[PDB]
Each structure stands twice: as structure tokens, then as C-alpha cells.
Design a protein that fits this description.
Its EC number is 3.5.2.6. By secondary structure, the chain is α+β, with helices and mostly antiparallel strands. The protein has a single domain, classed as Beta-lactamase, CATH 3.40.710.10. The chain is built from 12 helices and 14 strands. Bound molecules: zinc ion (ZN) (8 copies).
Amino acid sequence: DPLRPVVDASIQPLLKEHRIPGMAVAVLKDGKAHYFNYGVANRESGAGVSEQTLFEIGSVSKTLTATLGAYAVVKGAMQLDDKASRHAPWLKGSAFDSITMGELATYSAGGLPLQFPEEVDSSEKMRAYYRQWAPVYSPGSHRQYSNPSIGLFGHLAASSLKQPFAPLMEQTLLPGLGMHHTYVNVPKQAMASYAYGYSKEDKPIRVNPGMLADEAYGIKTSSADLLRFVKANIGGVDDKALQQAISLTHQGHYSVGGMTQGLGWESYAYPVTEQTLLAGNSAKVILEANPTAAPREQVLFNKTGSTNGFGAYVAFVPARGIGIVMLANRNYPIEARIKAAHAILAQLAG
Ligand SMILES: [Zn+2]
Ligand SMILES: [Zn+2]
Ligand SMILES: [Zn+2]
Ligand SMILES: [Zn+2]
Ligand SMILES: [Zn+2]
Ligand SMILES: [Zn+2]
Ligand SMILES: [Zn+2]
Ligand SMILES: [Zn+2]
């Protein structure tokens, strides 16, 4: 593959530096998909990684959940300006009577935390949590990355469509995106393709159960399926409704520095410097609260994602028809993901 030398040049050093057991890389250029596979999906057995290997993608799941929400909007089942309680009777009489679906989707509801408190481990406790939650900031004023925030958005989006989230995604949305091997719950026939994640101590692990995990960070997919998603975000899909939904996830709602927050996807003016990309994906933007600013007025879209044993990254530029997917079974530094992707994308762009 003429592109192997280029991809290898940025990926190989990464694998060695962070002792990554395996990584599936997929690139899109001139309409064609290119696959580069490294290492193993299972260290004990030695099973090799392929573009069909299933990896946990963590927060990258939010781009798919966001697409489901956009789909609900297109179908007329809900509007982003809808108060959250309009789609959950159990939220009536809480702070969510004055918070919108869009604010939940863009982490700007007012300070919902990164993760649910450790004690919130059941449906009953989760409902109680939201009903007692007190806003920290006025709605729309600050961005505080939050799983409970986007998780609730996805949960309610599914409810607006009158179907449970998991089956809705697996039986309708994902198939519509051409993603037939993407799961919230990996089925029996696909378990053999499911890689094992590896902690810092090299222990084989997989994602732990959690409230709204399916909506916020529970997707398992392959580099082939995720690149098909990238293609859908560029070349489009056959279904008009789904196409409209995809476009909605490209719209900027507000910005934080050089990063513009949309539904799921986070975008930047293209060409973008490695410095700007690193900043938008820095700990300051990820962990702390930051005031929202007016949205950006070519564009690169991206999203990072991790689980205790996995590290994923996806970035693409529609106007140039290029994109890259990097799925690894080691949660290695986000900065390393950005640097490798930026280098490869630069070569692909010309
Ligand atoms: Zn090589
Ligand atoms: Zn090729
Ligand atoms: Zn529910
Ligand atoms: Zn199939
Ligand atoms: Zn499940
Ligand atoms: Zn402030
Ligand atoms: Zn590492
Ligand atoms: Zn050039």
C-alpha cells in the first residue's frame, strides 16, 4: 500500500512508546478506505488485530448518540430547544424543567459533573440524583464535559422515538449508517472478534457497567465500521432523514478557544495547527468548566474516546475528503493520538 510507509511512520513509534498491544487504523482518501493493522487483540492467545476487530471506543460513542438525537429532531419527535422534562415525566419538578435537550447534548446545562457520583448505580438512584441536582451555572453559560449530561440527552432522545436506546441504535440507526458490526451489547456471534483491553498493569479488561453507559461511552465497533461512519459524514447516506441528521451534528453551537462544540462532534477551522488541536483536547477543556463563546463563523471534525483498557480517536475533513480512525486496546495519552493523526492527515491532504 503506497500509504503504508506514511501511516507506519506515525503509528509504529506510538505503539512502541506506549506498549500498545494492538491498533486498528483506517484512513479515507479519494473515496477509498485503507486499513493498517498492528499487533494483537488478545495478548494471551496472540489473535491479531484486523479491521473487523471490535474495540471499545468510549466517548466516541457520543457522536453516534448525537446522531440519534439529530435523527429524532429530523423525525419531529423532539426539538433541541425542548425542555428536558418534556421527554421524561420523572424530571418534572426539577431543574430540568428549565434546561434544554441541546444544552444536555453540548454539556452546557449548568455544571453536571464528568461522571455520576459513585453511589448512583441504579435506575432509582439515577432518577433521584437528577431530581436533586442543583445547577452550578446558568444554562448555556459554561461547558463542563459530562457523561450524565450527554447520557441523559441520548436516553431521552430514544424515549422521544418510543424505543429503548440499545435496540434503536442496533436495529435502526447503525444499520442505516451502514454499520452492521457496531454494538451497545456485543452479541454471541461477534464475541470472538471483541478485543480485550489492557490496563497500565497489562491486565485484560473490558468496560464496566454504569448508568447511561450505553448512551455515553458503551459502543464497541471496528475500524471498518467507524470509517464507514466517517464516510457517511462526508459522502453521505441513502436515507434522506439520516442525511439531514448527520448534517445537524456538524452545526456549531458555541466555542471554547479554537474548538467549536456541536452535537457529539467537536470542530476546528481547517487547516488546524497541532497546537490548536491539542488545546481543544486538553485536560483544561476536558476536565474543567469553561465559559462558552460564539461559534466559529474548511472544517475538521474530531472526537476522542477511552475506557480503562482502550484508546480511540477519529478525525476527518469533509472538504478534503480525508479521515482517520485509530482504535487501540490501551488507553494511551490523548496528546499522542492527536499528534499522530495530525501528521497522517497532513500527508493525506497534500
Ligand atoms: Zn512500514
Ligand atoms: Zn490501500
Ligand atoms: Zn429511562
Ligand atoms: Zn454482517
Ligand atoms: Zn447492556
Ligand atoms: Zn465562569
Ligand atoms: Zn499508555
Ligand atoms: Zn498542497
